[PDB]
Design a protein around this ligand. Structure first.
Ligand SMILES: CC1CCN(Cc2c[nH]c3ccccc23)CC1
Ligand SMILES: CC1CCN(Cc2c[nH]c3ccccc23)CC1
Ligand SMILES: *[C@@H]1O[C@H](CO)[C@@H](O)[C@H](O)[C@H]1NC(C)=O
Length: 354
């Protein structure tokens, strides 16, 4: 049950200029630290950010944040719920920048909102070092959905940040949940004229300009000016990262089907082959990712659900795979790290959530 701390450096703000922050449950008998990045879409122009402020203000402001918040799934401190890291120091960073954790722009004359996702992370790490992070041995940067993509964009900074601050011995790692998207062909098409018709490739390219967005340097050097949107897609940015990153991704992610303009509520040849192709292509992008967990389910997010221990791939649950990943960073008999389903339809894995 984690306690809120608003950032001491008041220049690092949410969208509306209110200070950003983090929730902390500290565990003095542990040198392990878990920093979780919240998700929740994004906004890429004035009009859609304005609408988001009326109906999703908690994702744009700290004004109405509660003082405590309860830890779930991987953020739980009970072994029964969290077999993986129940005794670790727990940190939940709320997503109030609407920029996929990439922005570095302040509010001012010329900017109605601030987009400081990359700087919010950066400062949480700084202030945590004065609360015990200085004695850590592993820092696991995790996140779900837009926070999952934020892990891929930010994990190597946090590594580079801690070396420049004199902490080269802390091992920085990443855990990206449901943030591994494909810029594939859509099932039905629309031109980018408003929020709901703009495909993520077009929406992200406009967002980076609007946010002053920042991407990892090696990926930036590959795709070069004005093609930085490529680095928000996992299979393109992952090969540029030096930190160890574990990738969790449903094969038939609900958010991926949404941006592909697919709805499930009588499926035919047209759509059957489309859905089957989607599972095939994302399985392909994971073939050479040594640490991964990809079940054949229709869902979205998992690592902070309380029942995250129920899903299995080839008999191995997600908390076990993460524990096997820790062992491999010291192949392991009966303790695998690469777990990708091979059956081709949603919920062909019986452990899929209902
Ligand atoms: C201190 C908080 C931030 C400001 N206020 C609303 C507000 C004033 N100006 C704005 C510009 C952009 C977005 C929101 C606002 C709510 C509480
Ligand atoms: C709660 C869900 C979180 C993920 N978001 C989609 C998304 C976030 N960042 C992206 C970058 C590229 C393509 C899609 C996305 C959907 C809402
Ligand atoms: C506060 O944060 C801003 C934004 O990153 C940074 O430029 C500034 O140096 C910080 N100030 C202090 C005292 O850490």
């Amino acid at each position: 049950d984690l306690r809120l701390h608003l950032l001491l450096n008041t220049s690092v703000t949410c969208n509306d200029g209110s200070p950003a922050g983090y929730y902390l449950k500290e565990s003095r008998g542990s040198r392990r630290w878990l920093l979780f990045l919240e998700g929740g879409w994004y906004c890429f122009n004035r009009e859609n950010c304005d609408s988001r402020y009326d109906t999703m203000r908690r994702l744009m402001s700290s004004r109405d944040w509660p003082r405590t918040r309860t830890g779930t799934g991987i953020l739980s401190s009970q072994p029964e719920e969290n077999p993986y890291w129940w005794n670790a120091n727990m940190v939940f960073i709320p997503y109030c920048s609407s920029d996929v954790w990439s922005g570095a722009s302040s509010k001012s004359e010329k900017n109605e909102y601030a987009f400081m996702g990359a700087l919010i992370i950066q400062e949480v790490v700084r202030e945590l070092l004065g609360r015990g992070l200085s004695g850590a041995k592993v820092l696991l940067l995790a996140g779900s959905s837009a926070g999952g993509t934020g892990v891929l964009l930010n994990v190597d900074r946090v590594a580079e940040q801690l070396e420049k601050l004199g902490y080269p011995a802390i091992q920085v790692r990443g855990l990206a949940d449901s943030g591994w998207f494909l810029d594939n062909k859509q099932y039905r098409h629309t031109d980018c004229v408003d929020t709901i018709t703009c495909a993520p490739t077009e929406a992200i390219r406009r967002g980076i300009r609007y946010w002053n967005g920042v991407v990892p340097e090696r990926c930036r050097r590959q795709f070069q000016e004005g093609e930085e949107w490529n680095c928000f897609f996992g299979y393109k940015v992952y090969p540029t990262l030096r930190s160890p990153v574990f990738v969790v991704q449903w094969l038939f992610d609900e958010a991926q089907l949404t941006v592909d303009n697919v709805h499930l509520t009588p499926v035919q040849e047209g759509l059957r082959l489309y859905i089957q192709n989607l599972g095939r292509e994302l399985r392909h992008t994971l073939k050479d990712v040594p640490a991964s967990f990809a079940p054949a389910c229709l869902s979205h997010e998992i690592i902070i659900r309380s029942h995250w221990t129920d899903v299995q791939v080839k008999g191995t649950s997600l908390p076990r795979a993460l524990h096997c990943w820790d062992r491999s960073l010291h192949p392991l008999k009966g303790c695998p790290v690469h777990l990708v389903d091979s059956c081709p339809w949603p919920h062909c894995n019986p452990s899929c959530p209902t």
